[PDB]
Amino acid sequence: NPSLRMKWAMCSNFPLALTKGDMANRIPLEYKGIQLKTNAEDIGTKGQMCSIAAVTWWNTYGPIGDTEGFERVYESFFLRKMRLDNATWGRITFGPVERVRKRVLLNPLTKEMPPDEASNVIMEILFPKEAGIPRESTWIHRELIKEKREKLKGTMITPIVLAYMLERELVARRRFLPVAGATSAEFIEMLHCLQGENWRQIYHPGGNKLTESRSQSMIVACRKIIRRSIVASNPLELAVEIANKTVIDTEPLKSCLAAIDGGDVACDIIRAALGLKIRQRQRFGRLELKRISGRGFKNDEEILIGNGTIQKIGIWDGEEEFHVRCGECRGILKKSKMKLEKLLINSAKKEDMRDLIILCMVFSQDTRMFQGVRGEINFLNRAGQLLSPMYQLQRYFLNRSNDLFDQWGYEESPKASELHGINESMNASDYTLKGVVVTRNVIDDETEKVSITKNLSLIKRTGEVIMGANDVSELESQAQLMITYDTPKMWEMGTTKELVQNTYQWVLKNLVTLKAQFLLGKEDMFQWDAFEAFESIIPQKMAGQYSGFARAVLKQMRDQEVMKTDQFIKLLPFCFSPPKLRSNGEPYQFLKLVLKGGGENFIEVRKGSPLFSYNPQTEVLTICGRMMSLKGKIEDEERNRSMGNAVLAGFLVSGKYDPDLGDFKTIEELEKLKPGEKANILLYQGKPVKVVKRK
Amino acid sequence: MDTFITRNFQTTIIQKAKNTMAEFSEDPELQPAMLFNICVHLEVCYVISDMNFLDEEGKAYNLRPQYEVIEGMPRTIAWMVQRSLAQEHGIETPKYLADLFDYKTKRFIEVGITKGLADDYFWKKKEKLGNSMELMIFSYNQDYSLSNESSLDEEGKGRVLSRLTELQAELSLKNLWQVLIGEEDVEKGIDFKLGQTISRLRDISVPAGFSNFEGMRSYIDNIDPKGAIERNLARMSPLVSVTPKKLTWEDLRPIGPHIYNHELPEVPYNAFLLMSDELGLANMTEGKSKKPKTLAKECLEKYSTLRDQTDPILIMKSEKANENFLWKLWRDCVNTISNEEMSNELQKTNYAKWATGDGLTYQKIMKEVAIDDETMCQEEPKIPNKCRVAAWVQTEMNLLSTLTSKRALDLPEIGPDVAPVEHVGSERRKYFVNEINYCKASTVMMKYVLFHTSLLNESNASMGKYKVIPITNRVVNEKGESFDMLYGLAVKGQSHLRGDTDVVTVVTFEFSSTDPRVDSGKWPKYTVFRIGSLFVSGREKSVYLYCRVNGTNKIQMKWGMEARRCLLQSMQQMEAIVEQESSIQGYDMTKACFKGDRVNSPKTFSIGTQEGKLVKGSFGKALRVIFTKCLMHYVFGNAQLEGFSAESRRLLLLIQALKDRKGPWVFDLEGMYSGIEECISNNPWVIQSAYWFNEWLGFEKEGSK
Amino acid sequence: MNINPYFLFIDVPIQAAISTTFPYTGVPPYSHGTGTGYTIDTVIRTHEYSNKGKQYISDVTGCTMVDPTNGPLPEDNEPSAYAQLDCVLEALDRMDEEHPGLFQAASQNAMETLMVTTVDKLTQGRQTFDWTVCRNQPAATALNTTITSFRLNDLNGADKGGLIPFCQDIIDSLDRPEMTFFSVKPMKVKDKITKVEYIKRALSLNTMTKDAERGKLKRRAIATAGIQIRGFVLVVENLAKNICENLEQSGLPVGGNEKKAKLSNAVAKMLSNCPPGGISMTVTGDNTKWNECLNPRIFLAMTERITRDSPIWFRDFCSIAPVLFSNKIARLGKGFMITSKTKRLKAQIPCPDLFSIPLERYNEETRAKLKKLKPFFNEEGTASLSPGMMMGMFNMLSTVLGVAALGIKNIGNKEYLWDGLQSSDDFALFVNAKDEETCMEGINDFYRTCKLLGINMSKKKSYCNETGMFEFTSMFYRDGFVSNFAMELPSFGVAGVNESADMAIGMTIIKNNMINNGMGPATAQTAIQLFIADYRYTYKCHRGDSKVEGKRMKIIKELWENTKGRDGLLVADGGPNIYNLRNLHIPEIVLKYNLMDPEYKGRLLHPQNPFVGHLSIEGIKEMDYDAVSGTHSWRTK
């Protein structure tokens, strides 16, 4: 058994093989009663055995060795991590996925080499003196050799590791793996997350340090603003407030939006909400329209879908011509009542034109598109509201492209030299989708003000809808710059640690106002936006009980003057949620309040937790590892009264540890106690206390 | 070198050579060497057939050349066309691959591009082939050897010589000539002669009716056995038939009816540790995971009343159990765990020796002595006893699937989720853990895994010592309080486990609140004393000590350490269901699956029966039930369960087919029923599975109407 | 109220929840003691299905030989190995007609692969029966021992490097009057054996009970062959694989996504090819006594027919392996244990002394077994097993035979067609006709045809139902939705090398199990959690803020307090777990590098760290993995 073989090595005094010399003796013979190394007189090997904890000692107090050039040695792993970091994640789709077994070069390579040639070059890079007889791959591969000489110079790392990493980046490692539409080497390293046996995930590996940092940041910022606004009632005021109180690391978002004419939809929506200038063009998701000729009327009627359901739709009737475009690929579309007359496109990336054409199909309202639906089309939105029928078909066919292609039908491509057809996979062929043709004569691709409504929809001066709140692309990504925000309403974006830190900072800064309002005794001080954001991380099932306990303890704190700043700060954030008392009418009781994420994400009610700690000797508040001083708001009597009267509801201190009364009492029996009875509790190890219930 | 290969050869040549390699299945990147050779070969076989054509009458100079290339194209097509030419022209077909065919001499060309001297290479190619083909060997040292006179004129020979003029030096000047591998190496092994002894073995390895191997080879090569299958089928007896039989709900009789026979004893309790009757002595702690011995000492200190008991009331005695010895062993365990010494070793005393079964293995003697002896005979193997249904298994299933106000799982953390896939994974884990963590089955599994880990560690590290191993667990209630639960104590015997199946005996004394006399048939294996009473819910509930002798090997302990895998089997399962309901809807259905939404109502599963009526539970309830089923599969897993599941899967699939109105057929139903029934001997889970299968089959029959 | 787990199936299809019926959480069955009983049972069963064939005495080894092929046709439904050569040839010829040139092309491909193959390839196999010591040893060790032995006897073919000279030496060794070899008696020694004894040892087979087999109540024995035949079986299997790759109905060799794709494509093709108004029915079959009933002589004929248009030398090379298999001899294992309970005494009777005691002292089962084995027994303790294929090792060739049987597609121009998929010992047979009765007639004709070729479909385990749902090699199909490939999910535990390469191996195995085998996102994340828990428990490196106490954990806590940036710490040092589905493939050290502060980062990445010491090319890479030569790359004692 290999797994068991080392669970017993740790029991050994020294299971590891120590080196010889200075680094052998840098770790002491013993440390705090723990053995690290030994002086064993081996027979003829001169060997020395080192402990297991010695690695921890090296990490803590070990000499700080030189690490220069380490990043250069492991350039392959660093490039992998940068590709992952600089990547953008798309939608996740559920459905049938067909994968084929292929030899697809698991990992990337700086330059693909045969094993012997790779060994020769490596020998040259590391040991030119010991290379032996000069070779020929040394001649031809001079460029890579010279670059690696320039790179691995000066590093003190062992040459064997350098050679191994060089082999990793040179020697190919090919294996048979299943692939479904992702064959690039950059994709295989994430093939595990790319798609399973019943779902697909869109992954776009990052490239270089792209220059469009500001645009990439503001796009995601505005997207989040929209996501937060849509769910909340009256997205208008909340969205404008958020966009006004957001800063891209040096400046407000508004200034950037005015400066750069970027964005696809979210920037336009935010600009309109703030009253700025935007480009004039209709959108239906990733595809934008620019009417050129014709007109149509909107009529509401029922239609039959292939799956066999009836739902009302406002269809557009009349001849129309559009300068349709999607991503980078341009084109022109002819639309009429239930017919796609003719479509022209240009050459571009296959996915770009695929999205273009499918979006034209769904927008065109062709009867074939109605008949090309098989599965249920009950898709939902982020707010949980049913999507409009047209956007429902758009999403369904984006998640399912083969079905519409098969159902639509093909025809013969035109005989013009520059006009040619395309297959389901965008492959040129005589059989082309009806009304769809490729072309080579590229068509060439200025601001106004647009009003906004409650539902974050742009409506022109005459009232036509130009941008819909459902057109926001779901391509999630990470901003290249460290954006910051001030509003509490959006703090849920950050990690629970960050949210807790932000809310505690907010309550600490305005502690005076909170105390002044609390002393009065109303309830509007429990409804602050910061607490609204904080309620997100509290679990719903226990949120009511937590809030009831917090309200009860604060009320007991206020009624009898045992006011303690630490406990007030700790338990204020939980008081938002409506109280949920027991059937007996008494508030629940707790030892520690658990938050979302489990584990460390818990606040201790008695001693302190990693997310909240107090040092009264130095009067220091440690929130999530960050230290602050509470001078000026801490009273000497507060230092005196430690914790006894602010841990339990309806209980107060009456004495000290009395072993005669009994051991420490748990909550199960504490809740069942009757007025006029004295019990004993434990704050933390070595600090017991006695309490008594008060009516 | 590939960048250099592309220079001398166009993309079509490279791709044809790479495809020809693809019919070899060795990494093309590994050795371009022969790739070079083959492409060169291919190249020459094309240059010999570049501008040389023939007319409809035979003019040497329309839509017909004077040559036809074989190399490069797929092997199957190449061979089919080669055979076509051979049969059309009535010429002997070479037994090796053909590289090029001529239209004037009607012969198959073979070409070889060698490094050094050509004549010797020509003779070696003749040795390989002989005279079945005409050979055109070329060598970069301006060397050539052609076996035919008028195969090609001087123009083609000069052209090919010029074409090889660059490659004879171009590789050297850019320093490539050195690593150029020859062409004979890939075909060094051609000679293979059988010895006399192997020849005789082949001769006697001929099918019946043939004198020797030569006759067999001649027969197989010459005779055309058309109609053999039809003739033999016609003359085969009709008795050899599959006996088709359309399946119907009537044919599906209950499986293993003997479990309804009351004469057989009801299947007794045999799980390693108590599962639903466990009574954990709870001690409140707020942190440090102290030593097992220290934890047991503290827990017993809290309940000194139970610990200090010394006048027990013997309630149940097993058939072959020594009550005095068991009680003395229990007292020794308690005293040792309650002493100040860190060591938890028990002196090898008489009662300890009996409980551990010291010195029971039979002595080994020489084979000759046994052979001489007459009274030494191979013992008849013990067969598992037949048992009937027992209600305690149903009670276990019902109780362990019920939610409890505790949490035993303490799974670690993972990195923050970023991509949508990890978001949905986190959602699914959140729901599944929120449901499972509050179930009794999870706590039982944690107890099992922790005890097995401790037992394996002790057996491996204390082979020759008797050790007392407390049965301990760490639990956390909904309010955040942490408790240490002591369920009992285990004595570990000698564990000189050499083989994987070597058995070490463990004596388990486990606290419980169930009076065994309530269900006597459930406790024939357990010696039960009444050690005391406790105040719990306003009542003085009795506390008994179930004492038993069990045994485990290395494999069982290692699998117990891995009992957490049950989670996975459950998780995957439910995940599949979620995935399925995503397919029907096209978007994440996890929230709709668990809690529902405005569009889709929460999912429900038929769970069980109440007063003979089918009842339905929520998604979480079904998850918990399948999790307890996985835990049961663990605790009651053995060959019987494997056989029963494997054989009953077919019956389940047939029932599914009947439900789908797929008119399933069977070929031998009685055989399948016998295969299913022979596995139902004494495993409690197997018996209860048979009972549940009968009940569910009855309900399905009722529904089918 | 009484719960009933099976009631789940009332609301969900069985296939959708088939995983519930697989008890893979339980301890797999394990065999105790000797495997001689099962080996004798296998020998008896193999000789029972062929006793009616021609029986004679081998003139090379003196063993009893039973040859069923060309024997009388069966008259009952019991397993029958009396395959007819004419029918096999007809099936192969028909398959050639459906695949023109496939046989000769595959023969040429295998022959050239065999030219380029080297002796070292033989080291890629699993345990093999070394005859110099008569025990199962790793393939490389057996190859080294046999090469040294051949060196001692003036057989230096392996020196040439190619596989052809090595196999030539192998066959020539059978001609040597006496052979000298290195044995272990422990110390190394030179021992000499006669020609007949060497022949028997080379043809001998080692037998052992199969352990940890799922879904089988009773244990079964398996056989490991010697190193001599590994080359010939390798080339034969390469030839059969080349044939299978081009066969549409061959359910091999790819697994996973291509498997489901092949199942669905076959089903759809089968529906589409149904005459209007007819019916399609699928038979899920299981072959009983698959290994036992197949005869090596039939495989010899198969190889001869496949290499019809191949050079004589290659025909001989292919034919060798069936010849040796047809003359194989089986070792009976360790023997039997006889015990006297009164005296509490036990004694092991080895195989040679099996009959040294009167059979009355054996139990009934062993008594009957030995009584039936008597004729096939040998004085040295081995049994003649001329029929049967106990070791398998012809999965590709057996699959070819099954596909050829599937290729007939009709008998007597009857009104039904049949096709399907075949993989080793499992198959799904689709039949189209005008009515279900005609489909059953066609299935009966297929059963008779399979009987004729030495394949016995199991009537007890097979079944039929209207096309649309079926099972194949643990893959369940129901209306397009294929459930999964039910496979024993492994223990995501400590890999067991060091601290860092351990984590690398764990994450790589999670990634591979996700990418190759069936596992979804939530399952993989729970897998990561479980693996991290086991890793932390094994190395006692729980989180720095984790209040667990321990010897090393104390210094870990001291580090945690000392540390300022806790985000960039390895789990080996009590750091937070950062791994997820996205970053499964990336080593943790590079992930956290940007976060780790120099105070500890410098110590971790110490060039001359005193732990790793001298490294080897195997050490960093040896399956392969990615890691950093830090302080967590230490080695064993």
Side-chain angles (χ1 to χ4, degrees), chain C residues 54 153 327-328 350 359 452 474 491 498 547 552 612 626 635:
Chain C
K54 180 193 169 185
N153 277 123
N327 303 279
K328 68 185 132 53
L359 277 60
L452 241 193
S474 65
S491 58
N498 54 58
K547 48 193 68 171
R552 164 177 188 170
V612 62
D626 305 19
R635 62 216 164 210

Side-chain angles (χ1 to χ4, degrees), chain A residues 59 62 99 164 168 173 192, chain C residues 257 573 581 603 624 626:
Chain A
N59 298 14
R99 334 198 283 161
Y164 166 80
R168 277 289 282 139
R173 290 192 181 165
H192 60 261
Chain C
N257 274 117
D573 312 338
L581 309 179
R603 296 156 156 105
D624 202 340
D626 305 19

